[PDB]
């Protein structure tokens, strides 16, 4: 009971407020959050667009 | 710390101890009030070698100047209880 | 036979190897008498004015006003312009800045140059 | 102030002074929070000598190091693309001078 | 500590001194038990070796010598206690030592709890309130002329009489007072 | 949207607060300790989550 | 801007009618009542001021030191209370009728927009500071001390004045606002190397600059608690801004007049800071302090561009509330010790810890702790500097190095170690003294959070 | 509630320098003529538990027994269930 | 938090079962981990790739002439 | 610069730690040449490999420090060599522990610090560098080994030297957890983030077998 | 999101891989951000459209604000007060103005760096060259002004520099 | 390592520069100087960012190393057969560039016996 009060009161309520404050105020605004494009590997498929990245040039595997 | 309170029971115990220990003393001999010099018939090295046993015994070394004047064991019980504030 | 021990400044010399003190006389020990007898005056006086219920306040030592005042406000009239104090103030008063002109001027009027020049490359360099 | 007697029972035990006695001119700056001028097991010039001689030796050993490195029997590691020209700094409108590596 | 040091050291606590340090730096040397009383001995059958030596000249050429041969082999990190004026928890509770006088300036509703503690304390500074007019005055007709000779005191010859100037040895505030 | 900001942002926040709860009630008793520690143990299980993002 | 002149001079009939035991409650209430009012005035443009009429205007230089200016009055009232209890009422009735005089005389300086009624207003404060250090002051030394405090200043200011009325026979005005737009550059001639010396030493006095700084440790040491808070937070700043405002008729003279005084600067930071190192008393410390921070700022003034602007204006203002909170810090010990000694009243945290608490706060803005505005003044001068040239960081260096030593020196000596046996008149520490500490610390700690409001007309 | 029992001291005739280095200790004296008065005191030292001493390899192989059990055991399961 | 312990004056002090098996139980994981890295991965101290004899390679693959054509 | 001042640093630090009679400073000097040794990684231009190192760093450095703490406490605030005496079996969680910190300190191979150091070592031998810089980075490893010796030796195996009343105990739970959750670290946590993390240098895939093994032989 | 205008601040379309899971056992990632909608976002969204609703109640508008051109300081009268006035609150904004551009360019070079991950030094480079040019534009238009810069100055450092480009390119004309 | 010993006790010029390899014609040694080929495109090699240093001629099996582990990342103990195929191109690699050094070296020894050869015969 008091682990349970505990994750509420000092998780959960301030991830709330993060969340929130991050993801109607912070991202209002241009260029605030910015993140690492994901890698980008043969053969992937992409949501957007569904294309398929082409694969390698056969390269003679040996060993 | 979680130290046990010693006493002067304990203290008067642990000097005898250490005393009884010295093979240059006969145990049956020394008393609490038993001089050092003239009773147990000591030199002034043996005093100095017993207030280092005294010192290695109870962890703390006693000052020169006040170790000089040590003469019985239960003046040695009594410095000790005095500087470690021990009330009974 | 062993290695000796050299004193300096910042490594005095230790009571045990002080040869003075082992050159004892008469009137060594009276110095040393008369030495511990100020000293046990003054230690009277102070545990006497120390353990009074009466006195609630602080107990004004002379000795620290005196180290104060000295330190301070008794230097003035006891100056005296010698060589040894007009070369000494010369040097520590003029010396540094005259130096760290020199050095400024010379580098500023380097930088100088070499923009007149064109050769410095601030690019990128907006804020001043 | 540091060498003076630790077992004495002084006015100020802290500071190890006694009220009423001449104060140092100096005092403030032989506090035992400063310089100490406590003897030494070994004298000053002894050490003085010893530091010196094992910083120079030092410098002077990695001066040497640096005259004479280290390294394994290998060439130069090959780089694919001009020695990844384009994504080095960039520029694509020169049209480098191109260096093709040798199979071996 | 507890004792006013003398005018001078005479040969024999210079000798005395001079063992109990030598002693200790060969502990500080011999780390184990076996070693340390073997060299421990050994050194106490050099030390003896001119016990019963007469002349003063000599005996002062000697422990002379014998501190420069100190000087050279003292183990530049001897041993010390944790409480020594060189250990590493020397002055470690001198920041929870706390003044009695502080106590004078408790709120009334600070003193009103530990109410005994204070009855005790009003008795305790009764009781140097009239023995201080004992004590200035036993002071004064025994001190000799002149000023002290020496910084020891008197203890209390009469009935009723405390030894002079008490009140800050008894009220010491303690060893570990937290 | 995007939990990493959040509990990365999250786990820092959160290791101040019993910096702000250090002049309430539970200051001036013995559980402060076990509050700090419990603190610091759910901002460490809070920040594994980004690493396993990241991994 | 009569809004707040207008107040402060009702100050005094309220003084003067009241009662002789409410003098300090309604003083005190009205003194923040008009810091209230005053918070106003922070409101600026990015253009170019904010003219309230032909006689005063107001600018993001002069808007946070006429703040800082009103603020500092109720603090000097709260800490001037204790010590003359045992004055008469008429007496008390007047040293609160110098500090209003003074409060009045600085808000009227800082907007003053012509030069001469500056010079005037800038030389009426001098009566009312002589008279407070040399009428309500415990030492002997006090009337040495004012002279200093007079003749030092006077010496600067009198070819000030000669300048100024010689530049309205050649221009016409001495409007700021003309003199900004009509100005023009001063030719290399000895003519005009003297009337550059004569419109800079003025102001070069009173920072001080080191050589000229000799009647600051005296006036600081032999004044009275609200003396010296009033001398170390606002007077110190009177030659800064002056320097801010004639400069822009000196250039391009100032590119090489500067040498003589950056270098006097560049090495008394240094010397000064150093001087803090060995020091016996208090007062003599948080004075050197004082000439340090000041030498930067003068530093920064003299290199002349916007990044050394907004780090004089900063830490102008930074400094302004350390040195007066430091003060307040050494006067509470010294009513209790009556010894103004740093040595001798020792381990103060055991006996008095929330004062500890404050001293620690106060010794860690002095020592410019990021991130708060001490170091955001610290660091665009130092920026500034290195744009100038690249060898001033070693000095810049030292000095910071130097400057954290003493402050823990300060905070050890007196804070820690363990207290003086002989001194059982320790007394808790007053509800007075704890609001006078927390009234100079918070507005630290709340303008770290809005930084361009105290950066000055060129953020 | 603390360490508040009356804890006993043992008897003084328990310690005997018999079995320890001290003997050598004697001995090498008493070859040159000498003795140890306080050797008697330290016998504790030797006496109880602290009578068997562990060496360097022997503190660094502290459990290498039920580890190499383990091991061989986990080996063995592995072996028997890949070769299947 | 735990039990009660006395002190013992110049004997050996009381053991738990508890802290003897578990610091055994410890060091026996420790042990049983070098062991199980070692057999499953050995190339990481041994190594897995030979090392090359440079003198051992022909001059046919090194592009060396017999000292007179170039 | 950056690779002299870590190699110097290392070598002279743990010299200066070869000797000492306080525990505390004993594992001090050693966290300052594991520093340096993190500084002569970065000279040879290996960030990620040095940042791997500051992560088991901190693990088996943090256990190390919390069982001289332990023994401390233990003995009455003593801090000196020279009086500890037997706890290989007087105290065996702490003796267990402070073993196997001691065994990932040096390296010893599948522990927390074998797969930060020993590439440390490998990649220090296969660079064009100082030579004097490598020599002293092989030294370091040497003394890092010794001075661990002398702690488990002075601290655990002889007899007892301490004062005779012994008051040793080991039975909180608060010890005992916080110990052996760093003691799970440094066995496992090597491993874990080693295999974890995306490989971000290229390999030193082929050693000659002196080479390869030369940690070990200087250890 | 409307709150910004795209072409000012340019985003490439950021194609993102699709899961191709390789094994059947089931992620933490997955399951650890499921819960982290179920539990967060839920709510966080719930309390955002009663805040919109209640601000979509009461809609209110505020205004840019326009300013007109006026006469900069070229075509001032010498000592004609009112027009120099009018010419330097004019300069002032526009200084304010280019600032505000060299910062626009400075975020969207910053952005493009964290963006490109690993390939920053190739892909940054049309950022780089356009930051290049806004700080050369810059730094002859505003630098070396000092902290009582005026547009007379700027007037004048330009006047400075066109008369050391004529004087250039009329003697490497006749050259 | 013997190199060092080699070069820096006997004679300089006898053994080749690290620095400034190599010192003779890619062609010197024989006619066909097959050119070695490169698996990844700019395209993918730059979608998979890498780094600067990791982008050599092995860098293909890397792609497969990345594509496997963020593939199967619960069981980061999956793909250990792409982890020894790029160990074996860095080896192969490594023993190219060994290759390299040893040629440059005996290239050296023969052109330094030449021209002692020609001195000799101009000499007699
Ligand atoms: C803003 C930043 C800070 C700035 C301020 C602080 C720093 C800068 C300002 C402060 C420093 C300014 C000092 C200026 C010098 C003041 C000299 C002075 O007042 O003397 C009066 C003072 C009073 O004369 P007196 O009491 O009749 O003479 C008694 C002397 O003891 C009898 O002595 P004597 O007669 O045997 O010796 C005199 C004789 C011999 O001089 C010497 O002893 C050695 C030579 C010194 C000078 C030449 C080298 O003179 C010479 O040969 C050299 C003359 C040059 O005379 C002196 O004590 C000084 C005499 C020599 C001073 C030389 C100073 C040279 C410094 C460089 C310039
Ligand atoms: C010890 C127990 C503590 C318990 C409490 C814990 C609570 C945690 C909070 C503690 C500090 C955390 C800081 C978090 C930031 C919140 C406040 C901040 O956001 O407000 C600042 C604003 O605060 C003010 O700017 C600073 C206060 C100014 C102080 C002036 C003092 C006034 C009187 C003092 C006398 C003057 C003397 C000095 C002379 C100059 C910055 O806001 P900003 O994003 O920018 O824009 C404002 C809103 N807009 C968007 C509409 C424009
Ligand atoms: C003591 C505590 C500090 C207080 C304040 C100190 C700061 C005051 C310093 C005054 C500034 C410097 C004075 C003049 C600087 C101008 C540069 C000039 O003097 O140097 C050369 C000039 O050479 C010499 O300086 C000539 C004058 C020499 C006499 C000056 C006295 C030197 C020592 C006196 C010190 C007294 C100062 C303290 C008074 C109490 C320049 O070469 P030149 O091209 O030719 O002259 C150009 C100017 N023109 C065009 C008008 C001709
Ligand atoms: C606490 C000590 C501080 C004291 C500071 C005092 C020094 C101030 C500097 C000199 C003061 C007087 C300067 C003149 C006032 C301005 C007048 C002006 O600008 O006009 C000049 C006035 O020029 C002068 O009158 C200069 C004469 C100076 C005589 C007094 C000299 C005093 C000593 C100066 C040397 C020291 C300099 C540094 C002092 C630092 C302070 C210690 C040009 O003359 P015009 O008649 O207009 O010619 C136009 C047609 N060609
Ligand atoms: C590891 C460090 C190195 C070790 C260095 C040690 C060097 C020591 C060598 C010199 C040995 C000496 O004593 S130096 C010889 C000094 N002279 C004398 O010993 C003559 C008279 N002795 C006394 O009077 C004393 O009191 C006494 C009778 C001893 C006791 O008496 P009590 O007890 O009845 O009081």
């Known amino acids: 009971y008091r682990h349970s009060i505990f994750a509420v009161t000092h998780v959960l309520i301030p991830v709330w407020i993060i969340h929130y404050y991050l993801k109607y105020h912070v991202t209002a605004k241009p260029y605030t959050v910015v993140e690492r494009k994901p890698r980008i590997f043969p053969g992937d498929t992409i949501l957007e667009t569904g294309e398929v990245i082409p694969l390698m040039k056969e390269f003679p595997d040996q060993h | 710390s979680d130290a046990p309170p010693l006493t002067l029971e304990a203290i008067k115990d642990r000097v005898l101890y250490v005393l009884k220990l010295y093979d240059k003393i006969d145990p049956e001999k020394l008393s609490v009030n038993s001089h050092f010099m003239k009773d147990l018939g000591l030199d002034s090295l043996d005093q100095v070698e017993i207030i280092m046993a005294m010192e290695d015994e109870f962890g703390f070394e006693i000052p020169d100047i006040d170790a000089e004047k040590l003469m019985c064991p239960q003046e040695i019980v009594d410095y000790i209880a005095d500087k470690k504030d021990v009330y009974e | 036979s062993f290695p000796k021990y050299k004193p300096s400044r910042l490594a005095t010399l230790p009571a045990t190897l002080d040869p003075a003190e082992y050159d004892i006389s008469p009137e060594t020990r009276k110095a040393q008498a008369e030495r511990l007898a100020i000293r046990s005056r003054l230690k009277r006086e102070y545990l006497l004015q120390y353990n009074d219920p009466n006195r609630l306040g602080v107990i004004e030592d002379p000795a620290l006003i005196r180290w104060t005042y000295a330190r301070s406000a008794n230097i003035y009239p006891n100056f005296r312009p010698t060589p040894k104090t007009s070369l000494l103030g010369a040097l520590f008063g003029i010396g540094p800045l005259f130096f760290w002109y020199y050095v400024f001027k010379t580098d500023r009027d380097k930088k100088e140059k070499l923009i007149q020049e064109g050769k410095l490359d601030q690019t990128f360099n907006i804020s001043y | 102030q540091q060498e003076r007697d630790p077992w004495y029972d002084w006015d100020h035990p802290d500071l190890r002074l006694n009220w009423g006695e001449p104060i140092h001119w100096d005092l403030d700056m032989y506090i035992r929070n400063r310089v100490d001028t406590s003897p030494t097991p070994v004298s000053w010039n002894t050490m003085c000598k010893h530091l010196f001689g094992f910083v120079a030796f030092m410098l002077f050993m990695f001066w040497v190091g640096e005259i004479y490195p280290s390294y394994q029997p290998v060439g130069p590691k090959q780089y694919p693309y001009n020695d990844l020209y384009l994504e080095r700094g960039g520029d694509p409108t020169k049209e480098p001078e191109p260096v093709v590596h040798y199979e071996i | 500590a507890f004792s006013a040091p003398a005018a001078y050291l005479t040969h024999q606590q210079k000798v005395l001194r001079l063992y109990k340090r030598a002693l200790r730096h060969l502990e500080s040397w011999c780390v184990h038990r076996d070693k340390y009383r073997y060299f421990a001995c050994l050194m106490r059958a050099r030390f003896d070796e001119h016990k019963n030596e007469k002349d003063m000249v000599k005996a002062t050429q000697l422990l002379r010598q014998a501190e420069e041969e100190f000087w050279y082999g003292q183990h530049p990190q001897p041993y010390i206690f944790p409480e020594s004026p060189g250990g590493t928890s020397y002055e470690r509770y001198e920041c929870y030592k706390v003044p009695e006088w502080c106590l004078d300036d408790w709120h009334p509703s600070e003193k009103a709890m530990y109410p005994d503690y204070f009855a005790k304390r009003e008795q305790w500074k009764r009781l140097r309130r009239e023995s201080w007019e004992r004590e200035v005055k036993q002071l004064q007709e025994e001190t000799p002329p002149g000023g002290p000779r020496t910084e020891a005191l008197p203890p209390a010859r009469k009935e009723g009489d405390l030894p002079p100037l008490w009140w800050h040895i008894v009220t010491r505030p303690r060893e570990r007072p937290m | 949207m995007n939990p990493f900001a959040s509990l990365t942002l999250t786990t820092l926040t959160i290791l101040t607060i019993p910096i702000m709860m250090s002049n309430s009630n539970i200051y001036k008793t013995n559980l402060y300790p076990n509050y700090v520690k419990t603190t610091v143990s759910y901002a460490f299980t809070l920040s594994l989550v980004p690493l396993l993002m990241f991994m | 801007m009569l809004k707040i002149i207008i107040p402060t001079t009702m100050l005094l009939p309220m003084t003067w009618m009241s009662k002789h035991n409410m003098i300090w409650i309604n003083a005190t209430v009205h003194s923040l009542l008009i810091s209230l009012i005053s918070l106003s005035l922070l409101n600026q443009l990015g253009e170019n001021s904010l003219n309230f009429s032909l006689t005063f205007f107001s600018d993001s230089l002069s808007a946070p030191l006429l703040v800082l200016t009103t603020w500092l009055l109720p603090l000097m009232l709260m800490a001037s209370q204790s010590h003359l209890s045992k004055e008469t009422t008429t007496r008390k009735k007047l040293y609160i009728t110098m500090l209003i005089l ?358 | 509630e603390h360490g508040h029992s009356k804890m006993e001291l043992p008897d003084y005739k328990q310690w005997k320098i018999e079995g320890t280095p001290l003997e050598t200790v004697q001995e090498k004296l008493a070859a040159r003529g000498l003795r140890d008065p306080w050797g008697r005191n330290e016998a504790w030292r030797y006496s109880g538990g602290f009578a068997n001493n562990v060496s360097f390899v022997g503190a660094l192989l502290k459990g290498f027994k039920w580890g190499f059990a383990a091991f061989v055991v986990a080996v063995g399961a592995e072996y028997y269930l890949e070769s299947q | 938090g735990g039990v009660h312990i006395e002190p013992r004056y110049r004997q050996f002090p009381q053991l738990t079962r508890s802290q003897l098996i578990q610091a055994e139980f410890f060091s026996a994981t420790m042990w049983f981990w070098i062991l199980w890295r070692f057999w499953h991965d050995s190339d990481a101290v041994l190594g897995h790739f030979p090392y090359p004899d440079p003198s051992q390679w022909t001059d046919e693959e090194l592009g060396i002439l017999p000292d007179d054509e170039d | 610069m950056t690779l002299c001042l870590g190699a110097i640093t290392t070598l002279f630090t743990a010299l200066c730690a070869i000797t000492q009679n306080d525990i505390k400073k004993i594992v001090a000097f050693s966290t300052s040449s594991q520093l340096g040794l993190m500084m002569v990684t970065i000279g040879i231009n290996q960030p990620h490999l040095a940042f791997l190192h500051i992560c088991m760093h901190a693990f088996f450095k943090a256990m190390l420090f919390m069982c001289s703490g332990s023994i401390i406490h233990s003995l009455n605030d003593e801090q000196d060599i020279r009086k500890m005496g037997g706890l290989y079996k007087a105290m065996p969680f702490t003796t267990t522990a402070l073993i196997i910190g001691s065994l990932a300190l040096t390296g010893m191979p599948y522990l927390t610090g074998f797969y930060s150091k020993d590439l440390i070592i490998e990649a220090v031998n296969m660079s064009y560098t100082n030579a004097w810089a490598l020599l002293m980075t092989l030294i370091a490893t040497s003394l890092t080994a010794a001075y661990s010796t002398r702690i488990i030796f002075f601290a655990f195996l002889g007899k007892p030297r301490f004062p005779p009343l012994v008051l040793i105990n080991e039975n909180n739970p608060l010890l005992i957890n916080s110990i052996k959750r760093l003691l799970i670290g440094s066995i496992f946590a090597g491993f874990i983030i080693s295999n974890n993390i995306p490989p971000m240098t290229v390999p030193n895939t082929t050693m000659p077998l002196y080479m390869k093994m030369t940690a070990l032989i200087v250890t | 999101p409307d709150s910004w205008d795209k072409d000012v601040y340019p985003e490439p379309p950021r194609r993102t891989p699709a899961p191709a899971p390789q094994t059947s056992l089931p992620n933490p990632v997955t399951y650890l951000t499921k819960i982290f909608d179920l539990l967060v976002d839920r709510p966080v969204t719930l309390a955002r459209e009663f805040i919109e609703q209640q601000h979509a109640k009461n809609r209110y508008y505020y205004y840019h604000r326009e300013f007109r051109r006026v006469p900069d300081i070229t075509e001032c009268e010498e000592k004609d007060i009112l027009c120099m006035f009018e010419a330097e609150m004019q300069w002032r904004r526009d200084y304010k103005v280019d600032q505000e551009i060299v910062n626009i360019i400075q975020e969207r070079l910053k952005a493009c760096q964290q963006r490109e991950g690993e390939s920053y030094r190739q892909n940054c480079a049309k950022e780089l060259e356009q930051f290049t040019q806004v700080s050369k534009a810059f730094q002859d238009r505003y630098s070396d002004l000092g902290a009582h810069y005026s547009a007379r100055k700027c007037l004048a450092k330009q006047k400075q520099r066109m008369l050391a480009e004529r004087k250039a390119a009329k003697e490497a004309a006749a050259a | 390592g013997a190199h060092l010993a080699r070069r820096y006790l006997g004679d300089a010029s006898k053994e080749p520069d690290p620095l400034r390899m190599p010192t003779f014609p890619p062609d010197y040694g024989f006619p066909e100087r097959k050119e070695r080929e490169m698996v990844a495109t700019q395209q993918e090699m730059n979608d998979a960012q890498l780094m600067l240093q990791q982008r050599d001629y092995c860098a293909h099996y890397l792609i497969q190393l990345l594509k496997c582990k963020r593939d199967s990342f619960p069981n980061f103990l999956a793909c250990k057969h792409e982890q020894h195929d790029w160990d074996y191109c860095e080896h192969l690699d490594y023993v190219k560039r060994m290759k390299e050094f040893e040629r440059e070296r005996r290239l050296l020894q023969r052109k330094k016996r030449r021209e002692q050869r020609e001195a000799e015969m101009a000499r007699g």
Not at chain 7, 121 to 140: H, S
Not at chain 7, 151 to 175: D, E, H, R
């Open chain 7, 102 to 459: 003074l409060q009045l005389f600085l808000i009227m300086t800082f907007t003053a927009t012509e030069l001469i009624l500056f010079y005037i207003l800038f030389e009426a404060t001098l009566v009312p500071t002589l008279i407070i250090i040399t009428r309500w002051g415990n030492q002997t030394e006090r009337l040495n001390a004012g002279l200093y405090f007079l003749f030092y200043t006077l010496a600067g200011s009198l070819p000030l004045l000669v300048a100024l009325v010689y530049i309205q026979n050649t221009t016409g005005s001495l409007n700021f606002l003309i003199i900004h737009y009509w100005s023009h550059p001063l030719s290399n001639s000895w003519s005009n190397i003297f009337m550059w010396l004569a419109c800079i030493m003025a102001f070069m006095v009173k920072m001080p600059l080191y050589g000229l700084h000799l009647w600051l440790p005296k006036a600081h040491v032999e004044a009275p608690i609200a003396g010296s808070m009033v001398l170390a937070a606002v007077l110190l700043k009177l030659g800064g801004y002056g320097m801010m405002r004639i400069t822009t008729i000196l250039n391009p003279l100032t590119n090489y007049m500067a040498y003589p005084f950056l270098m006097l600067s560049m090495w008394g930071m240094i010397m000064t800071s150093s001087i803090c190192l060995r020091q016996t008393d208090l007062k003599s410390l948080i004075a050197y302090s004082s000439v340090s921070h000041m030498a930067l700022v003068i530093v920064a003034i003299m290199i002349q561009t916007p990044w050394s602007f907004m780090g004089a204006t900063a830490l102008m203002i930074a400094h302004g509330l350390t040195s007066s909170m430091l003060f307040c810090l050494a006067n509470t010990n010294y009513e209790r010790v009556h010894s103004r000694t740093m040595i001798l009243a020792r381990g103060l945290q055991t006996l008095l810890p929330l004062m500890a608490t404050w001293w620690l706060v106060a010794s860690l803005t002095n020592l410019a702790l990021p991130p708060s505005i001490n170091l955001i003044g610290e660091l665009f001068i130092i920026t500034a500097s290195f744009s100038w040239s690249n060898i001033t960081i070693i000095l810049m260096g030292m000095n910071m190095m130097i400057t954290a030593l003493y402050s823990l020196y300060m905070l050890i000596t007196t804070q820690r170690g363990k207290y003086t046996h002989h001194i059982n008149n320790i007394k808790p520490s007053f509800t007075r003294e704890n609001a006078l500490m927390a009234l100079h610390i918070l507005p630290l700690l709340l303008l770290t959070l809005n930084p361009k409001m105290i950066l000055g007309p060129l953020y």
